[PDB]
Amino acid sequence: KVFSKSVPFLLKPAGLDGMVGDVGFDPLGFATFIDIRWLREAELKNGRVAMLAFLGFIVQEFIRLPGDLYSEPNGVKAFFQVGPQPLLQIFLFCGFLEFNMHKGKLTQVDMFEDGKREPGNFGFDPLGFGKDPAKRERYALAELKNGRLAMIAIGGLVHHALVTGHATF
Amino acid sequence: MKDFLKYLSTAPVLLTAWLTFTAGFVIEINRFYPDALTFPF
Amino acid sequence: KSTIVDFNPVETSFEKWAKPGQFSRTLAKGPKTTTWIWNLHADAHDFDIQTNSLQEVSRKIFSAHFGQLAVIFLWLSGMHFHGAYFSNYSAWLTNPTSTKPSAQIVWPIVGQEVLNADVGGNFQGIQITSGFFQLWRAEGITSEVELYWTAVGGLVASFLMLFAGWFHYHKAAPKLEWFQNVESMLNHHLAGLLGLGSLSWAGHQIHIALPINKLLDLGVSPEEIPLPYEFILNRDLIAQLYPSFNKGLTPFFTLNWGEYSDFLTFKGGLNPVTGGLWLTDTAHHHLAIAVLFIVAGHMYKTNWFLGHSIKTILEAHKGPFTGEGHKGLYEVLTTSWHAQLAINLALFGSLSIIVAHHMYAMPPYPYIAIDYPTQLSLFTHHVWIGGFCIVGGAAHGAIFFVRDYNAANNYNNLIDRVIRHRDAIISHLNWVCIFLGCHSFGLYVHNDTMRALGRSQDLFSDNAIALKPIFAQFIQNLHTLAPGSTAPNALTTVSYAFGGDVISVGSKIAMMPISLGTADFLVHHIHAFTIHVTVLILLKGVLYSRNSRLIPDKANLGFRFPCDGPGRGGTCQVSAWDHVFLGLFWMYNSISIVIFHFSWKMQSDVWGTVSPTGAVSHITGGNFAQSSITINGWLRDFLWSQAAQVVQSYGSSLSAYGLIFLGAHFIWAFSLMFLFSGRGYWQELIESIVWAHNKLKVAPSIQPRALSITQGRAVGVAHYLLGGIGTTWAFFLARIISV
Amino acid sequence: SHTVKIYDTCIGCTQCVRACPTDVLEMVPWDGCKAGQIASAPRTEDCVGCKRCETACPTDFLSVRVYLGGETTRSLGLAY
Amino acid sequence: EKSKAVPFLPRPAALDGSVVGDVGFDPVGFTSWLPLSYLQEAEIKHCRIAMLATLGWIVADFVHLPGAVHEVSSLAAHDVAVKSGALAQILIWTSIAEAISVIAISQMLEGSGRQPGDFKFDPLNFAKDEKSLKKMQLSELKNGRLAMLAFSGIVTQAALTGHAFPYM
Amino acid sequence: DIGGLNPCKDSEVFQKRLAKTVKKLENRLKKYEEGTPPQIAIQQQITQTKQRFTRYADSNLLCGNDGLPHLITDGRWSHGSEFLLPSILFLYISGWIGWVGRKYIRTVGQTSNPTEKEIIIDVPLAISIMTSGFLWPFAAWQEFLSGDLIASDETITTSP
């Protein structure tokens, strides 16, 4: 028996072999009954959204926009003060982005049905970082780790605002 | 735990779990926002 | 390698949990139509068709009994836990006559918190009609901590019974010879179970319930009453209430049992303080029952040259009119579980009905006679359980006749001779049923039409043509004269229902002489007629379960089959199951009439309030005597009149009873769709629905089929019973809680 | 008496004949199927209409068909 | 035959010699109908939990964390900690650890090779070869049993008599 | 206004109903003692009743002559939160349920044992299909266009 590298008292999970964040961490075996490509796509998207949202917290409490609506240093209270109209526009824009970036196939059964789709690979690289394949793997691992850390931190900041109410500081 | 998970995948257990979860979130919506006669918006 | 058990017969594995229908040879292949799903549950406990060995069936039955007892223990633990945590038992103890027992509080969701009623004692909740508070008080339980510990013990016992079932199916399963030791089983169930349970309960009553309840009746608050264990460690806390414990057990071993007359009395009547039976009388009763049952347990020969053989007893009881007599009955009852189930279920339902009668007749718990909802609920529930169990006993007798009956082994015995003249039995029972129905009901209809025609002197009433139940009144007179004449050591009659004084607790009547007039004559004959018709249906099912003039090979079609075909003019419902279906309907009718008679008679001529000068005013006002003799009277002065509380319960704490009233009406009417219709129409409608699904590519692989004819009948009867019983349940509960 | 008809979809599996409770059906030689036999109904006067014959028929929509008709003490199953 | 612990009782027939802390003590034959690895895991879990619990009870009756909520005796600390939510955090993280334990014990029972109670948690070494590991396993088992009995006595005495650290 | 109804904010009978309910609840509250849980529960009932009546008053709700909110479901967007928005919400949810059920039926209908996978659900595949129902309006008007939504003549028909 091999046993996992992360959880040393557990057997090595299956389906994670050719990935860019494999430390053998899957005690519940989510990769066995869920497609690993979909799981990586979801992890990357959740991580990127969490990173953007954490940066949004830190900037919102600091900078903010001119106007009476955009005057709440607290993100949770800003979600309510801003009203539904600005939020629904963000929702529709995110939907438009989702549709055009995945080119129609948006669901768990439709995406990766034909393969030829690296999980999380939207081809988005205008600044050109990533031409060298040597640093590409390191960049992918850094993105994954930062995304996970940002998921934890996004939960932390949101719940700090809920239990205190003032801000993050 | 290979056949136990298959037993939990049977129609009665899955229907009971799904209906319990469904009644649960319905009851909790009606607890946190009670007496909702019209759409909140 | 024990001689009674087999070790590790079945492996404890989850593999068969993932293969539904593995027990059945036909269902194991997997579902092809939706009929497979229904067949899966209809054959789950039919262990006879799952194995060909009586040993395996017996082991499955034994483990199923353990599972059932674990379920019962869990239910009891839940009841005690609710009494401990979600009840006003402590408040009810200090004010039994003014606080309504409640042991279930309702969460505040969707406005349902209105169900939390003003039961009293600074408590809100649902009023409890199961009488647990009175039972706990009779047990001497004076604190909710004791209820919590009883609940914990119940949980432990339930786990123990679950473990016992698992152990005796998978680790050490008894052999067939162990199960067939009916002599040993009877000896143990009679001495150990019954007698030693009575003895242990007598000990508990004498040492815990007798002193604690005596202190409670004396006015001592539950907080200053000593803890129950102190009544055992200290022979002076109990010797003050009963000054006979000072002599210890010496009077018992010296045969001077007269010294124990302090706490082993024979009084009769009711306790004037609580309205229940004297707990000293109860303890003496349980002691006598224990001795009698222990003696009765030393009857059958088990392992020594001592006792009786049931085979030799039965085989010696022949006669000129009965041929071989009881020869072969021992083989029938030791090789067929269905025959044992028939006898046990019939006698068990009859026992439940007898219990229901003796409950209200002689209230055995403190402050339970003045809790009218508890009395009504207990009587109705126990009578319903008795009727259901009796129908089940008839059903399993029919099942035994179809399946486990061997013609060769029963040559010219009682079973054979009964089948040989089944025609005579059924024809005479038919004539008796027609006679009884004609008379009882047509006397009712004659009263109704005489009243409708303005001829009040032509009725079958007391102020008219009178049918006095003289035989029952003679018995009532004999019982009220028994103390001092035939029961010379009695101080009071067994029940005040036979006659005597009005017993009131807190201005509420506990018991009172139940007068019998022409109204009781008619309703008693209605009871006899309904019981006779139910017996007719069930006995026709049992006797004609194997063959008939219509179908000479009905036994080859099994116990459960819809018909033999449209031929012979139509052979619907010829089974024996279709007789347990019709008998279920008629049992519902009979029990409904019985509980209606009880409710109206008690409310009109027993229950009520007593004025300080001794004037008795009842709940309804004595309208039973003159208005229960016509069907219009039953419709108006009982149904319409006492349904006022149910229909006016909306917005109050009894609104749940109105909702259940309406829902039970809905379910009862829903049943008629299955009872009146047939399978072909529903199959052909499912055909068009399946066409639509196929048109939308959503037709299930498991082909949807309409419920089988037998299952359609079963669904119809189940819904009918549920709706009717629920309607009566809501009506009774709302009416008797409001007033 | 009821009417019983046999149709050439008969596969000669004999399940109808051995299910008749009143000896109405019988197997007769034939050349329209592999078994070389076809059911016949030469004693329909004893037909009771119980339709056990077509409950045992394996062919798609039956090869033995029972049409209920005039009633008789034999067809009504009257022992009296 | 003739188990070491109870010399007049037969050997439990499931504990020959190949388990740490195996003196053949199973008079009521718990090992005759339950897996040995399952019972070993349960015993080791109890040992560790009760060792932590005894140390915490004794220490918290001496040293208190800053704050008014932490100014109660260990006997009354349960109702205070549950109200403040202190025990909720322990419950959450213990539940996470116990779900991972569900996975681990399932894998151990269905093959794998993980010894009962072996989570491979060993930042320091403290056990370099087989002999040291066996000796330290025996020490852990004996200390855990002693601490289970000690916590039992501590709780029973403290509940009987509401005394401070000397629960006499 | 619409249909002769009037807003509940100006309906006297509505306020009479509120006052009567509050008075009944307070009378019930009078028979308990101090800050005991029954009094807390009755006070919560009173607070919830007042909040519900206030919300119904300030909700563009039309009340009849009985002082009860009447629903205007003719289709006008003015009273669109009474029927139209809940109608859209239910249509979305029910279309989701039907779509995931149909997709699961068609997916396990092409396996070796289609009937087995209906009493014993393939929970991985079931979860995969169920979370994909958020696009059911788009999936339906992408399968109907391709002719994959409707069968044509393989469907069975009775004799006549």
Ligand code: CLA
């Ligand atoms: C004095 C001895 C004794 C006692 C007390 C019992 C008691 C019982 N037997 Mg039993 N039995 C005995 C001897 C005894 N039996 C013998 C010698 C045989 C062999 C012929 C059988 C064969 C037998 C069968 C085949 C069945 C029973 C069943 C039952 C139960 C009937 C259900 C009932 O009334 O609920 C009353 C319930 C209670 C009062 C609960 C407390 C009872 C507990 C469990 C004590 C049981 C005593 C037990 C025999 C002690 C053995 C302990 C074990 C470690 C050896 C009841 C618990 C039936 C049953 O329900 O199966 C489980 C059943 O199907 N018995």
Ligand code: CLA
């Ligand atoms: C000690 C009691 C007892 C026992 C051990 C049995 C045991 C048995 N009976 Mg039996 N029976 C009993 C009492 C009993 N019965 C009673 C009292 C009746 C009269 C109604 C019957 C009537 C009866 C018939 C008519 C038949 C049996 C059959 C059987 C056998 C198969 C049972 C099965 O698979 O059902 C599995 C269990 C179910 C299918 C459960 C069905 C659910 C029920 C009907 C509804 C319960 C509703 C419940 C009250 C909750 C409603 C509340 C609502 C709000 C939801 C089995 C040997 C059958 C057989 O073939 O025997 C060989 C058969 O045809 N019995």
Ligand code: CLA
């Ligand atoms: C109100 C409806 C109703 C009535 C009146 C009856 C009546 C009867 N049923 Mg029942 N039954 C009913 C509903 C009813 N049933 C339902 C819903 C079911 C479904 C489960 C059944 C299922 C059922 C079974 C399975 C059996 C019966 C049997 C009987 C008969 C018992 C013998 C008897 O009393 O005959 C006497 C007749 C009456 C009491 C009816 C009223 C007669 C009046 C009062 C006296 C005579 C009037 C006079 C002749 C009128 C002449 C004037 C006229 C010509 C103008 C009796 C005919 C049993 C049977 O066959 O009989 C033994 C039997 O086995 N019934």
Ligand code: CLA
């Ligand atoms: C079974 C384990 C256990 C449990 C349930 C508790 C529970 C409690 N302790 Mg406690 N404690 C423990 C072990 C335990 N302790 C140990 C081993 C020590 C010695 C360091 C202490 C020292 C201690 C002090 C000094 C105080 C408490 C206090 C308290 C109470 C509230 C605050 C709190 O949770 O402690 C906070 C706990 C600490 C600050 C130290 C805990 C150190 C841990 C147990 C050692 C490392 C283990 C590791 C983290 C395990 C990982 C778990 C895994 C699932 C991830 C609460 C009743 C406080 C109180 O109210 O006293 C009445 C208080 O002042 N404890």
Ligand SMILES: CC(/C=C/C=C(C)/C=C/[C@@]12O[C@]1(C)C[C@@H](O)CC2(C)C)=C\C=C\C=C(C)\C=C\C=C(C)\C=C\[C@@]12O[C@]1(C)C[C@@H](O)CC2(C)C
């Ligand atoms: C921090 C955390 C996890 C941190 C892990 C980190 C950062 C490391 C992550 C990574 O290394 C991995 C793993 C793998 C790498 O590939 C990726 C990176 C990213 C490198 C979880 C916190 C988890 C935090 C949790 C669970 C907090 C729960 C708090 C609760 C429940 C509070 C409740 C109360 O506040 C209320 C509600 C009311 C009050 O009155 C009472 C109380 C009880 C106090």
Ligand SMILES: CC(/C=C/C=C(C)/C=C/[C@@]12O[C@]1(C)C[C@@H](O)CC2(C)C)=C\C=C\C=C(C)\C=C\C=C(C)\C=C\[C@@]12O[C@]1(C)C[C@@H](O)CC2(C)C
């Ligand atoms: C609990 C949690 C993470 C828990 C992580 C744990 C335990 C990790 C444990 C480990 O790492 C360690 C310790 C060590 C590792 O080696 C092993 C593991 C085991 C992996 C994240 C919560 C994460 C929680 C999150 C992200 C919640 C975000 C909430 C948002 C955005 C809410 C928005 C709103 O609330 C507003 C603002 C207004 C409302 O009215 C409307 C809405 C919209 C609802």
Ligand SMILES: CC1=C(C/C=C(\C)CCC[C@H](C)CCC[C@H](C)CCCC(C)C)C(=O)c2ccccc2C1=O
């Ligand atoms: C409607 C009907 C059907 C069709 C009924 C069917 C197909 C039953 C469908 C049951 C569904 C599929 C499951 C049950 C759904 C309920 C909502 C669950 C019960 C409610 C719980 C609270 C118990 C018959 O097959 C039939 C046969 C013979 C005589 C009469 C009838 C008859 O009336």
Ligand code: SF4
């Ligand atoms: S279907 Fe109904 S009617 Fe036709 S035979 Fe069977 S039972 Fe008699």
